Design an enzyme around this catalytic site. Structure first.
Site, short mmCIF file in Angstrom:
data_model
loop_
_atom_site.label_atom_id
_atom_site.label_comp_id
_atom_site.label_asym_id
_atom_site.label_seq_id
_atom_site.Cartn_x
_atom_site.Cartn_y
_atom_site.Cartn_z
CE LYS A 9 -51.02 -7.53 65.46
NZ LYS A 9 -50.27 -7.24 66.85
CD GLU A 13 -43.21 1.31 51.30
OE1 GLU A 13 -43.38 0.43 50.54
OE2 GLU A 13 -42.35 1.38 52.05
CD1 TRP A 28 -43.84 12.15 50.31
CD2 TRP A 28 -43.45 9.71 49.67
NE1 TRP A 28 -44.96 11.29 50.90
CE2 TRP A 28 -44.63 9.91 50.36
CE3 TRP A 28 -43.09 8.81 49.02
CZ2 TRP A 28 -45.24 8.91 50.62
CZ3 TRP A 28 -43.99 7.47 49.12
CH2 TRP A 28 -44.97 7.44 50.03
CG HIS A 82 -53.41 8.66 50.34
ND1 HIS A 82 -52.41 9.53 51.21
CD2 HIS A 82 -53.07 7.60 50.67
CE1 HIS A 82 -52.10 8.97 52.29
NE2 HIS A 82 -52.30 7.70 51.97
CB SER A 122 -32.99 -4.13 47.25
OG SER A 122 -33.73 -2.71 47.34
C1 HEA Z 1 -47.13 3.86 59.06
C2 HEA Z 1 -47.58 5.11 58.68
C3 HEA Z 1 -49.03 5.25 58.63
C4 HEA Z 1 -50.10 4.45 59.25
C5 HEA Z 1 -50.11 3.47 60.32
C6 HEA Z 1 -51.37 5.01 58.74
C7 HEA Z 1 -52.39 4.53 59.30
C8 HEA Z 1 -53.57 5.21 58.97
N1 HEA Z 1 -53.62 6.22 58.13
FE1 HEA Z 1 -52.39 7.22 57.21
N2 HEA Z 1 -50.95 8.41 56.40
C9 HEA Z 1 -49.48 8.11 56.35
C10 HEA Z 1 -48.96 7.19 57.17
C11 HEA Z 1 -49.61 6.11 57.85
N3 HEA Z 1 -51.07 6.00 58.07
C12 HEA Z 1 -48.75 8.71 55.59
C13 HEA Z 1 -47.11 8.79 55.50
C14 HEA Z 1 -49.72 9.68 54.88
C15 HEA Z 1 -49.30 10.85 53.88
C16 HEA Z 1 -48.72 10.59 52.75
C17 HEA Z 1 -48.79 11.72 51.84
O1 HEA Z 1 -49.88 12.32 51.57
O2 HEA Z 1 -47.84 12.48 51.12
C18 HEA Z 1 -50.98 9.04 55.30
C19 HEA Z 1 -51.96 10.09 54.81
C20 HEA Z 1 -53.18 9.58 55.43
C21 HEA Z 1 -54.56 10.18 54.98
C22 HEA Z 1 -54.67 11.30 54.02
C23 HEA Z 1 -55.08 12.61 54.55
C24 HEA Z 1 -54.88 13.68 53.44
O3 HEA Z 1 -54.18 13.37 52.51
O4 HEA Z 1 -55.47 14.83 53.64
C25 HEA Z 1 -55.59 9.71 55.43
C26 HEA Z 1 -56.95 9.57 55.47
O5 HEA Z 1 -57.60 8.83 55.15
C27 HEA Z 1 -54.92 8.30 56.37
C28 HEA Z 1 -55.58 7.65 57.08
C29 HEA Z 1 -55.18 6.43 57.88
C30 HEA Z 1 -56.02 5.76 58.66
C31 HEA Z 1 -57.55 5.91 58.74
C32 HEA Z 1 -55.16 4.77 59.24
C33 HEA Z 1 -55.12 3.54 60.40
O6 HEA Z 1 -54.24 2.66 60.19
C34 HEA Z 1 -55.01 3.89 61.65
C35 HEA Z 1 -55.53 2.98 62.66
C36 HEA Z 1 -55.34 2.96 63.89
C37 HEA Z 1 -56.28 3.37 64.95
C38 HEA Z 1 -57.70 3.82 64.45
C39 HEA Z 1 -56.05 3.32 66.42
C40 HEA Z 1 -55.53 2.27 66.78
C41 HEA Z 1 -57.11 1.49 66.96
C42 HEA Z 1 -58.10 1.67 68.11
C43 HEA Z 1 -57.54 2.57 69.31
C44 HEA Z 1 -59.24 1.00 68.11
C45 HEA Z 1 -60.46 2.12 68.45
C46 HEA Z 1 -60.42 3.23 67.45
C47 HEA Z 1 -61.48 3.31 66.66
C48 HEA Z 1 -62.69 2.42 66.70
C49 HEA Z 1 -61.47 4.34 65.58
N4 HEA Z 1 -53.58 8.41 56.28
C1 HEA Z 2 -40.21 7.77 58.48
C2 HEA Z 2 -39.77 8.67 57.69
C3 HEA Z 2 -39.77 10.01 58.39
C4 HEA Z 2 -38.94 10.40 59.68
C5 HEA Z 2 -38.08 9.49 60.48
C6 HEA Z 2 -39.23 11.85 59.75
C7 HEA Z 2 -38.61 12.80 60.74
C8 HEA Z 2 -38.86 13.89 60.92
N1 HEA Z 2 -39.48 14.63 60.00
FE1 HEA Z 2 -40.53 14.14 58.17
N2 HEA Z 2 -41.15 13.70 56.61
C9 HEA Z 2 -41.56 12.50 56.05
C10 HEA Z 2 -40.86 11.29 56.56
C11 HEA Z 2 -40.44 11.26 57.86
N3 HEA Z 2 -39.86 12.26 58.57
C12 HEA Z 2 -42.33 12.36 55.05
C13 HEA Z 2 -42.43 10.93 54.23
C14 HEA Z 2 -42.58 13.86 54.60
C15 HEA Z 2 -43.36 14.31 53.52
C16 HEA Z 2 -42.48 14.59 52.46
C17 HEA Z 2 -43.21 15.63 51.37
O1 HEA Z 2 -43.92 16.27 52.16
O2 HEA Z 2 -42.91 15.67 50.18
C18 HEA Z 2 -41.88 14.52 55.68
C19 HEA Z 2 -42.20 15.70 55.87
C20 HEA Z 2 -41.72 16.41 56.99
C21 HEA Z 2 -41.92 18.09 57.04
C22 HEA Z 2 -42.65 18.93 56.21
C23 HEA Z 2 -41.75 19.62 55.17
C24 HEA Z 2 -42.99 20.27 54.18
O3 HEA Z 2 -43.03 19.31 53.10
O4 HEA Z 2 -43.20 21.33 54.24
C25 HEA Z 2 -41.17 18.34 58.25
C26 HEA Z 2 -41.02 19.70 58.87
O5 HEA Z 2 -41.95 20.03 59.26
C27 HEA Z 2 -40.60 17.08 58.73
C28 HEA Z 2 -39.94 17.19 59.82
C29 HEA Z 2 -39.50 16.12 60.58
C30 HEA Z 2 -38.69 15.97 61.72
C31 HEA Z 2 -38.39 17.43 62.44
C32 HEA Z 2 -38.40 14.83 61.97
C33 HEA Z 2 -37.59 13.83 62.92
O6 HEA Z 2 -36.00 14.57 62.80
C34 HEA Z 2 -37.99 14.18 64.40
C35 HEA Z 2 -37.05 13.95 65.44
C36 HEA Z 2 -36.63 12.42 65.38
C37 HEA Z 2 -35.42 11.98 65.29
C38 HEA Z 2 -34.28 12.97 65.04
C39 HEA Z 2 -35.06 10.33 65.33
C40 HEA Z 2 -35.02 10.09 63.55
C41 HEA Z 2 -34.01 8.80 63.59
C42 HEA Z 2 -33.94 7.92 62.68
C43 HEA Z 2 -34.79 8.13 61.58
C44 HEA Z 2 -32.88 6.85 62.63
C45 HEA Z 2 -33.49 5.65 63.18
C46 HEA Z 2 -32.43 4.38 62.82
C47 HEA Z 2 -32.31 3.34 63.67
C48 HEA Z 2 -33.18 3.36 64.95
C49 HEA Z 2 -31.51 2.25 63.45
N4 HEA Z 2 -41.03 16.03 57.71
O1 LIG Z 3 -51.78 6.32 54.35
O2 LIG Z 3 -52.50 6.03 55.22
CU LIG Z 4 -53.13 5.71 53.00
#
Ligand code: HEA
Ligand code: HEA
Ligand SMILES: [O-][O-]
Ligand SMILES: [Cu+2]
Ligand SMILES: CCCCCCCCCCCCCCCCCC(=O)OC[C@H](COP(=O)([O-])OCC(O)COP(=O)([O-])OC[C@@H](COC(=O)CCCCCCCCCCCCCCCCC)OC(=O)CCCCCCCCCCCCCCCCC)OC(=O)CCCCCCCCCCCCCCCCC
Ligand SMILES: CCCCCCCCCCCCCCCCCC(=O)OC[C@H](COP(=O)([O-])OCC(O)COP(=O)([O-])OC[C@@H](COC(=O)CCCCCCCCCCCCCCCCC)OC(=O)CCCCCCCCCCCCCCCCC)OC(=O)CCCCCCCCCCCCCCCCC
Ligand SMILES: CCCCCCCCCCCCCCCCCC(=O)OC[C@H](COP(=O)([O-])OCC(O)COP(=O)([O-])OC[C@@H](COC(=O)CCCCCCCCCCCCCCCCC)OC(=O)CCCCCCCCCCCCCCCCC)OC(=O)CCCCCCCCCCCCCCCCC
Ligand SMILES: CCCCCCCC/C=C\CCCCCCCC(=O)OC[C@H](COP(=O)(O)OCCN)OC(=O)CCCCCCC/C=C\CCCCCCCC
Ligand SMILES: CCCCCCCC/C=C\CCCCCCCC(=O)OC[C@H](COP(=O)(O)OCCN)OC(=O)CCCCCCC/C=C\CCCCCCCC
Ligand SMILES: CCCCCCCC/C=C\CCCCCCCC(=O)OC[C@H](COP(=O)(O)OCCN)OC(=O)CCCCCCC/C=C\CCCCCCCC
Ligand SMILES: CCCCCCCC/C=C\CCCCCCCC(=O)OC[C@H](COP(=O)(O)OCCN)OC(=O)CCCCCCC/C=C\CCCCCCCC
Ligand code: CUA
Ligand SMILES: [K+]
Ligand SMILES: [Mg+2]
Ligand SMILES: [Zn+2]
Lengths: 230, 226, 459, 65, 62, 180, 107, 65
Positions: C306, C230, C125, C278, C152
């Protein structure tokens, strides 16, 4: 007492425009794409008519809403150009020592900067007349002459350039940045061809929008000139 | 108001081509039976007829003078209604800020319907609380559950109608002596003579009473091309 | 009418409806992935059709992110309540609102049609070049979908920003959540469009940006400059919902409203400047790595504030009120689950830890716990809170403790083992693996089939 | 009118035709098929079978079945 | 604003009621089924009814 | 007691699946012929003619509601003069038994209570400070470790041998210096 | 921070020795799914739904004032389910200040 | 991406970048790894096997192979 807003309940242009977009993808002929573009223009113009007809609501906030939308759009235009400048500078370390001929810093930059400046002066005069509830017929035709010369010069440059897009990322970035500016110049033609005197004067969002856009495009060329020619 | 857009040309005066062509019936129509355009031209014709007769103004009472110009003498009933109308209009695009409401003096919430959504923010300073929204329905003295601020709904309703400037004028203004067309003619000859028209409205109005096209230049005035 | 309607509340319903539909395709793809990974061998995909698996994971990710969760949390709940929260009659731009949902549907049809008609290959993706630019036409079709989706998203962002001009009440925290996401979109999308156009230029216009002497790492910078914003464009609306639910259901005024608002603003600014976490394993300069690692860890501060402000909202609430409502349970579950996802995010934020954990299933479990569990549950909780206002029925969800418990247990069975295999290590985006990783993969697979079965009980 | 007060009045007042619900579920079902049908088609195209037999890409015992 | 979209309008009276030829009131489709089974439990839950009120919400087995 | 038995009579079990007979037995798709129901179908749903084919928003059946005097019908309040004062009696909603069914008796008691607010400003301010700065301290505790480990990876080492590794689709090429 | 309205001791002094805190039930009643009659048509079922709104309910105190259904946000103020056009009359957020002008009073 | 978990190495093999990674093996053995960047159809089928032997053994091996 009336409602604060005259709600629009139904609209069918959205379906048409979205289908028109799909035709660009689902087609087997490039002629179909040309005629599809005309359909897009037509329906976008209908949407503009809806905006003009919304004037009948006498809503004070309508001008402000549209004005701020333009601000956001201009911002998106500026950020797209930034992305091209970024693409250009990321490979800066591989420029100026390759066996290609980069552009001169004397001819193209000067005549273009002088030309685009005159375009700004015309638009500025249009704004001044807009403020003074006055009109000068010749102004728009000066814009047409300026656009004609700009098109004539850019066409010759591309055709007589001895380096191609596949020669280096430098050449690709040069051509692409210049094309992106030209497209925004052509969009300015699209907007300016309808300029006329409207008697509702400074409650017309068109006038402010044109002034902002033309200034954006000219300013964008100053940045390009420094990066590429100078 | 700040929420209104720019005055139209019509907001100042109406074109003489919108004058009803049956002036004789217009000046005899009761006020309750006159539409917006008819009421505009009834007042303008009658009001300018009295104002363009200087010798009679000093002997005319303010009650009679106001009637001729179509101005409504104010009284507590009409003042109350007009005031609440203008307060409703102001609140359309303005904030709602005032003194703390109590049983003696509830917060007045104007409405046309039987309900209006209202929020209580409490008192001033530390007595201010988060917005507590409630539906203010008529016939109940509402009390905020948090600060005990009393609210009340005021309805702009009169006899199957809501309150408007037109409704207030119709309900309280009383038609006086029927307008005499002789006054129109007399004033017309005063300011319009020998190709000089210093009362254009009375030249058009007299022409219509005469039947349209009778006075000099009026056929040419009424002949249009599109 | 149905398609012509401009009502902002109707369009909000359309967004939720379409997210569920497209979501069915998303979940099906997830089931394919987990079934395949149940053991070592080929199970449901032939070794000669491995390109299909690469396409399955690519489409899964793209659809769930851009066509399901984003349309659901930024298009669905927002379009239905935001104009009400703003005590305004309707949305500022009625006609734009209509075209936005139609655009989403049209881009979805293009994507799925490309599955059926084009050769099935995948590049993730994240569409990294040069792999993305040496593929077949299915990649071209996916690019068109993303660009169309971008249109959109931006116009919807413009729509929400205009509420500031018309809002007749107080900007509540939720309204602040949407406005900031809109700002994040206005600033990030134009950069994405540019880099996507460059992918197209190399695919379709013989450009040479992603061939030698052109830096492929350039794409990753511009992509992730949108990528990480995003992930916060997808989570911030969820935070806004959580705030409303906790305050309403506990009958407690939001504590530290201004700190909540200023925490959302802070997360956005910081989220706009930390993208290169990343790109830790590419080989960036030491000082760059240290900058990004430092700023990435800072995001925890506003995010932590928060979380603790939410906890005190639930503390002290009256005992007489029944606490088994599904919306309340989901809101509480979000705090418990989000902390797990965030903490693991901080672990991966350390680059040296990241060297071991990049491109492993630990990253998967990290973003699943936040999105697949946290974001989904937040959207469910928000819809559940508005059940009376929305008016839907024919489901048994509002009071269903079995559904919540089974979902929580089984969702954790899927992704908790994926943290373990991250130190085993099992790479991501693979289908075959060594026989000594079967146990954990098998456990997670059993979890996936079970979760699907629980989705049938709601009807 | 009273009938027009509520959006989607027939559904909210519980009078809607059930076919609308059936179409929504059918649409979701078709969406799901876009992941399964091309899987079967692609498997057959490159192998000749719609679905594999577990571990048929590896060495199997003589009695394996 | 005279002649603009009214802030408030009263609902017109509902259309005439329909009886069958025998006088039975004509019934219309209603998606509130009375399921057939032997369970008769009734579960009640105190629910938030705003800030200062609650409502005793009941779920019936039928 | 069982509250369902109170309103059992109102709930008569249904006969048709989805509450409609086969269209052959009764055509619910057609518009009703009953006077005053031209905008409804036979089954009571709104007719497509009323809502789609001849929708008033599209210019069909143009009928301006407002009258000449800019007025629309408005229903007045229930006014009751008494004790030298004009009173308005508000409209009370019907009993919830009529609308929902359960008999309104044996209602559990939920007393009035003002909002549950956190007090002691000084204490609250200190907690909020901790809610922000306890995480800040932890981050600062990781900062120094992060710098050190980053510096360690990027250390100029006296390497004595080089192995070149090229990644191709789909294999790894290795180039190594050969012993002399 | 908000800690309730300030109270002066004089305001806590009763006018009778038997005054206690009024025990009025703020539970609105027992509810469930709104149950429509089969006989009612679409128009009459709309009236039924409009008469079952909890946000139109209140509790009357001993002095005749009523404490209404209140909510932190205006989302709970529209009819459930939400009608096509909700806030025709702009909802009024009442702010309080100590400023006054002479025209409002009479001597 | 050249990944050897036991040696603590995960370096992306990016076209145009010749990334330097320094290592010092402390114990003999065979360390297995896999490509860690989706690289096409057979991303899962290009493993990384490194065997560390005594310096005297390495010299003999290099001399013969
Ligand atoms: C909505 C989805 C979402 C959210 C909120 C976050 C939040 C964060 N993500 Fe993300 N991240 C993803 C979705 C998300 N990420 C996805 C989808 C990828 C993979 C994409 C891909 O590679 O294809 C990814 C990948 C990703 C990587 C890549 C790792 C790798 O590629 O090997 C890293 C590392 O820096 C990272 C870091 C973080 C951090 C540091 C936060 C922070 O926002 C977390 C902050 C929250 C807390 C820290 C906990 C609450 C806070 C407290 C409890 C306070 C006390 C805690 C401390 C004082 C530490 N994320
Ligand atoms: C938000 C986005 C999203 C969501 C919901 C999920 C849901 C799930 N994903 Fe996800 N997943 C991704 C985003 C997401 N994933 C992304 C971004 C990657 C990486 C892509 C890549 O590698 O290139 C990934 C990769 C990924 C892999 C890695 C495959 C690989 O690259 O090797 C696997 C399997 O292990 C997996 C499993 C699942 C399973 C088992 C669930 C769920 O089925 C678990 C069960 C939960 C549900 C069945 C509820 C979900 C319901 C809804 C989403 C509808 C909500 C709508 C309303 C509430 C109106 N996901
Ligand atoms: O992506 O955190
Ligand atoms: Cu990031
Ligand atoms: C859109 C056109 C763009 C053209 C760009 C061309 C660039 C080259 C230089 C041109 C120089 C002229 C001025 C151009 C600037 C714009 C002028 C302007 O605003 O006019 C307004 C003027 C009136 O505008 P308005 O809106 O009515 O009034 C606006 C103001 O309120 C009242 O305005 P004002 O009265 O204040 O005037 C402003 C003043 C400002 O301008 C100046 O003062 C600039 C002076 C520059 C001097 C340069 C030396 O401009 C003038 O005085 C313009 C006079 C033009 C008279 C044209 C009469 C018809 C000529 C027909 C020629 C036919 C030839 C056939 C040959 C056949 C061979 C076989 O417009 C016109 O009259 C229309 C014409 C505009 C000028 C066109 C010039 C074309 C030149 C062609 C040359 C061909 C040579 C061929 C040689 C062949 C050899 C074998
Ligand atoms: C030689 C050649 C020379 C050159 C020639 C050049 C010519 C150039 C021509 C240029 C223009 C061409 C285009 C003209 C467009 C005209 C538009 C217009 O003005 O229409 C007015 C016209 C007004 O109609 P009317 O005459 O007043 O009467 C209409 C009827 O009374 C009906 O009344 P109604 O409108 O109230 O009823 C509509 C509604 C009625 O509702 C229902 O049917 C039941 C309720 C919904 C059921 C649940 C559906 C699922 C939930 C969806 C949730 C999201 C909805 C979002 C909003 C709707 C978006 C469509 O149902 C529908 O019709 C569609 C419902 C939604 C369908 C999609 C749902 C998702 C399915 C996913 C399945 C796969 C996974 O619009 C329409 O009603 C129809 C518009 C149809 C547009 C279709 C565009 C489809 C594009 C698909 C993708 C294309 C690429 C791939 C295709 C591959 C095919 C194999
Ligand atoms: C994640 C899942 C789990 C989620 C769990 C959690 C859920 C929590 C709760 C969420 C709640 C969200 C908010 C809900 C709000 C609801 C509001 C509402 O009801 O609005 C009213 C709205 C419309 O009601 P209305 O106002 O009475 O509308 C009247 C109509 O406008 C006018 O009436 P009409 O009768 O005139 O209508 C026109 C009608 C006329 O219809 C007819 O005449 C139909 C005739 C029968 C056809 C039946 C289908 C036949 C199929 C044949 C297939 C053959 C295959 C052969 C294969 C052979 C192989 C060898 O339709 C049309 O003409 C157009 C239909 C277009 C749409 C259907 C498209 C189907 C798929 C097409 C695929 C095409 C692929 C092509 C590929 C090509 C490649 C080259 O309701 C709906 O549209 C139904 C909604 C139902 C669900 C509501 C939500 C309930 C709660 C959730 C339940 C769980 C759902 C799970 C997802 C689904 C799983 C599958
Ligand atoms: C008086 C006007 C001054 C204007 C100054 C504007 C400053 C804006 C800076 C924004 C980005 C700053 C990032 C930090 C500086 C890093 C610079 C740097 O390292 O540049 C090179 C490095 C690329 O090299 P490598 O990836 O290591 O290898 C390439 C091999 N072919 O980084 C880049 O690509 C820089 C890209 C950003 C340039 C464009 C910035 C935005 C321009 C906005 C214009 C309006
Ligand atoms: C592009 C879409 C921009 C949308 C936001 C700005 C819209 C805007 O201001 O348009 C109106 C504005 C002026 O209308 P007024 O009646 O003064 O204002 C409307 C009511 N107050 O109209 C214009 O800008 C004129 C447009 C004319 C050219 C249209 C060309 C379309 C080209 C499409 C190519 C594909
Ligand atoms: C949000 C809007 C502001 C964003 C500002 C982001 C700047 C972050 C600074 C990061 C930094 O130190 O830049 C290094 C980093 C490159 O590092 P290396 O590839 O290791 O090369 C260094 C020497 N060869 O710089 C970049 O990539 C900068 C990218 C340009 C960002 C431009 C944003 C434009 C916004 C409008
Ligand atoms: C068996 C698999 C699951 C089938 C299923 O649940 O389908 C439900 C779904 C909706 O039905 P109801 O919820 O009863 O809606 C009508 C009004 N109450 O039913 C259908 O769509 C029937 C056709 C299913 C075809 C599946 C292929
Ligand atoms: Cu090579 Cu993956
Ligand atoms: K497998
Ligand atoms: Mg990687
Ligand atoms: Zn209060």
């Amino acid at each position: 007492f009336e409602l604060n807003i005259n709600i629009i309940n139904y609209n069918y242009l959205g379906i048409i425009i979205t289908v028109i977009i799909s035709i660009y993808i689902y087609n087997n002929s490039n002629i179909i794409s040309v005629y599809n573009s005309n359909l897009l223009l037509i329906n976008i113009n209908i949407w503009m008519k809806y905006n003009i007809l919304d004037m009948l609501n006498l809503n004070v906030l309508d001008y402000k809403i549209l004005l701020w939308i333009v601000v956001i759009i201009i911002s998106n235009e500026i950020l797209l150009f930034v992305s091209f400048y970024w693409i250009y500078y990321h490979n800066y370390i591989n420029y100026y020592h390759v066996n290609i001929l980069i552009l001169n810093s004397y001819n193209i930059v000067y005549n273009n900067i002088i030309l685009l400046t005159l375009l700004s002066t015309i638009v500025n005069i249009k704004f001044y007349n807009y403020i003074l509830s006055y009109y000068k017929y010749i102004l728009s035709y000066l814009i047409y002459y300026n656009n004609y010369m700009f098109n004539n010069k850019i066409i010759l440059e591309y055709k007589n350039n001895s380096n191609y897009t596949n020669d280096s990322v430098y050449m690709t970035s040069y051509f692409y940045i210049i094309l992106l500016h030209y497209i925004h110049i052509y969009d300015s033609i699209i907007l300016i061809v309808v300029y006329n005197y409207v008697n509702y004067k400074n409650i017309n969002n068109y006038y402010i929008n044109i002034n902002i856009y033309y200034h954006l495009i000219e300013v964008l060329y100053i940045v390009i000139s420094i990066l590429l020619y100078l | 108001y700040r929420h209104w857009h720019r005055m139209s040309e019509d907001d100042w005066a109406l074109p003489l081509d919108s004058m009803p062509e049956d002036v004789k019936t217009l000046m005899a129509t009761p006020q309750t039976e006159r539409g917006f355009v008819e009421d505009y031209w009834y007042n303008r014709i009658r009001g300018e007829a009295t104002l363009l007769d200087p010798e009679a103004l000093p002997s005319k009472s303010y009650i009679a003078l106001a009637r001729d110009m179509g101005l409504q003498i104010v009284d507590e009933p009409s003042s109350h209604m007009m005031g609440l109308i203008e307060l409703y209009e102001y609140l359309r695009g303005a904030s709602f800020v005032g003194p703390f409401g109590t049983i003696e003096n509830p917060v007045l919430v104007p409405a046309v319907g039987q309900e209006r959504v209202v929020a209580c923010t409490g008192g001033v300073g530390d007595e201010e609380h988060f917005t507590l929204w409630f539906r203010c329905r008529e016939g109940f003295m509402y009390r905020c559950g948090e600060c005990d601020q009393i609210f009340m709904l005021v309805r702009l309703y009169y006899e199957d109608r809501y309150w408007t400037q037109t409704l207030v004028r119709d309900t309280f203004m009383s038609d006086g002596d029927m307008f005499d067309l002789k006054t129109l003619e007399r004033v017309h000859k005063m300011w319009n003579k020998d190709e000089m028209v210093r009362w254009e409205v009375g030249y058009w109005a007299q022409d219509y009473v005469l039947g349209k096209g009778v006075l000099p230049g009026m056929v040419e005035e009424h002949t249009r091309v599109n | 009418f149905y398609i012509l309607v401009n009502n902002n509340k109707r369009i909000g319903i359309y967004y939720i409806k379409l997210s569920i539909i497209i979501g069915i395709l998303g979940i099906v793809l997830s089931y394919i992935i987990r079934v395949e990974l149940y053991n070592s061998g080929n199970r449901i995909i032939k070794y000669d059709n491995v390109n299909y698996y690469n396409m399955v994971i690519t489409l899964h990710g793209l659809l769930m992110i851009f066509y399901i969760i984003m349309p659901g949390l930024y298009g669905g709940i927002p379009l239905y309540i935001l104009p009400i929260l703003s005590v305004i009659t309707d949305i500022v731009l009625p006609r734009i609102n209509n075209i936005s949902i139609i655009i989403v549907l049209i881009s979805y049809i293009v994507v799925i049609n490309s599955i059926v008609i084009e050769y099935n290959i995948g590049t993730g993706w994240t569409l990294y070049p040069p792999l993305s630019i040496i593929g077949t036409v299915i990649v071209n079709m996916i690019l068109y979908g993303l660009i169309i989706i971008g249109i959109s998203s931006i116009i919807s962002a413009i729509n929400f920003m205009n509420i500031l001009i018309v809002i007749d009440g107080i900007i509540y925290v939720y309204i602040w959540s949407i406005i900031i996401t809109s700002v994040l979109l206005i600033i990030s999308l134009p950069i994405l469009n540019g880099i996507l156009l460059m992918i197209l230029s190399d695919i379709y216009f013989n450009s040479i940006y992603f061939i030698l002497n052109g830096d492929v790492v350039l794409y990753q910078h511009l992509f992730w400059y949108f990528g990480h914003p995003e992930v916060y464009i997808l989570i911030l609306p969820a935070f806004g919902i959580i705030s409303i639910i906790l305050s309403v259901l506990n009958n407690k005024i939001i504590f530290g409203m201004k700190s909540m608002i200023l925490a959302i603003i802070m997360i956005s600014i910081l989220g706009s400047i930390v993208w290169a976490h990343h790109i830790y394993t590419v080989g960036l300069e030491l000082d760059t790595k240290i900058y990004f690692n430092n700023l990435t860890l800072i995001i925890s501060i506003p995010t932590g504030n928060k979380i603790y402000n939410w906890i005190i909202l639930y503390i002290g609430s009256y005992n007489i009120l029944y606490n088994g409502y599904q919306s309340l349970i989901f809101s509480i579950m979000f705090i418990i689950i989000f902390i797990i996802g965030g903490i693991t995010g901080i672990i991966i934020s350390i680059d040296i830890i990241d060297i071991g954990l990049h491109d492993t299933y630990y990253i998967v479990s990290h973003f699943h716990y936040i999105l697949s569990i946290g974001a989904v549950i937040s959207l469910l909780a928000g819809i559940l809170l508005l059940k009376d206002i929305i008016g839907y029925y024919n489901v048994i969800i509002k009071i269903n403790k079995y559904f919540g418990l089974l979902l929580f247990i089984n969702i954790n069975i899927i992704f908790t083992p994926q943290f373990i295999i991250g130190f085993n290590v099992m790479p991501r985006r693979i289908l075959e693996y060594s026989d000594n990783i079967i146990v954990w993969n098998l456990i997670s697979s059993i979890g996936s089939i079970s979760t699907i079965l629980i989705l049938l009980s709601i009807f | 009118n009273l009938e027009d007060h509520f959006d989607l009045a027939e559904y909210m007042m519980k009078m809607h035709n059930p076919m609308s619900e059936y179409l929504y579920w059918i649409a979701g079902f078709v969406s799901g098929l876009h992941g399964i049908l091309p899987l079967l088609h692609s498997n057959y195209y490159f192998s000749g079978m719609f679905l594999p037999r577990d571990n048929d890409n590896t060495q199997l015992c003589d009695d394996s079945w | 604003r005279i002649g603009g979209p009214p802030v408030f309008m009263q609902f017109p009276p509902p259309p005439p009621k329909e009886y069958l030829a025998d006088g039975t009131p004509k019934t219309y489709p209603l998606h509130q089924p009375v399921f057939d089974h032997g369970y008769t439990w009734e579960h009640w839950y105190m629910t938030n009814a705003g800030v200062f009120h609650t409502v005793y919400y009941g779920e019936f087995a039928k | 007691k069982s509250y369902y038995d109170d309103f059992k009579d109102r709930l008569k079990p249904g006969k048709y699946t989805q509450g409609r007979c086969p269209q052959s037995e009764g055509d619910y798709r057609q518009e009703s012929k009953t006077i005053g129901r031209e905008h409804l179908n036979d089954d009571g749903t709104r007719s497509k003619r009323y809502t789609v084919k001849e929708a008033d928003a599209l210019g069909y059946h143009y009928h301006p509601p407002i009258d000449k005097k800019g007025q629309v019908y408005v229903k007045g309040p229930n006014t009751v003069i008494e004790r030298g004062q004009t009173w308005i009696k508000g409209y009370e909603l019907p009993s919830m038994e009529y609308t929902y069914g359960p008999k309104q008796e044996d209602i559990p008691f939920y007393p009035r209570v003002k909002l549950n607010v956190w007090g002691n400003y000084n204490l609250v301010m200190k907690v909020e400070f901790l809610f922000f700065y306890l995480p800040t301290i932890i981050v600062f505790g990781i900062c120094i470790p992060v710098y050190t480990i980053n510096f360690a990876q990027e250390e100029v080492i006296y390497t004595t041998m080089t192995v070149k590794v090229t990644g191709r689709q789909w294999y790894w090429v290795y180039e190594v210096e050969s012993p002399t | 921070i908000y800690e309730g309205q300030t109270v002066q001791e004089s305001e806590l002094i009763p006018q009778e020795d038997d005054w206690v805190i009024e025990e009025t039930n703020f539970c609105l009643g027992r509810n469930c799914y709104v149950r429509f009659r089969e006989e009612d048509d679409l128009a009459r079922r709309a009236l039924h739904q409009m008469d079952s709104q909890l946000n139109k309910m209140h509790t009357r105190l001993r002095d005749g004032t009523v404490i209404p259904y209140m909510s932190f946000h205006p989302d709970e103020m529209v009819d459930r389910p939400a009608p096509i056009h909700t806030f025709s009359e702009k909802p009024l957020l009442k702010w309080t200040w100590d400023e006054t002008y002479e025209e409002a009073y009479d001597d | 991406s050249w990944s050897v978990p036991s040696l603590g190495i995960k370096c992306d093999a990016t076209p145009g970048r010749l990334v330097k990674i320094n290592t010092f093996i402390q114990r003999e053995g065979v360390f297995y790894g896999q490509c860690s960047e989706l690289c096409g159809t057979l991303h899962a089928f290009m493993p990384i096997v490194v065997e560390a032997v005594s310096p005297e053994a390495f010299a003999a091996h290099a001399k013969k192979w």
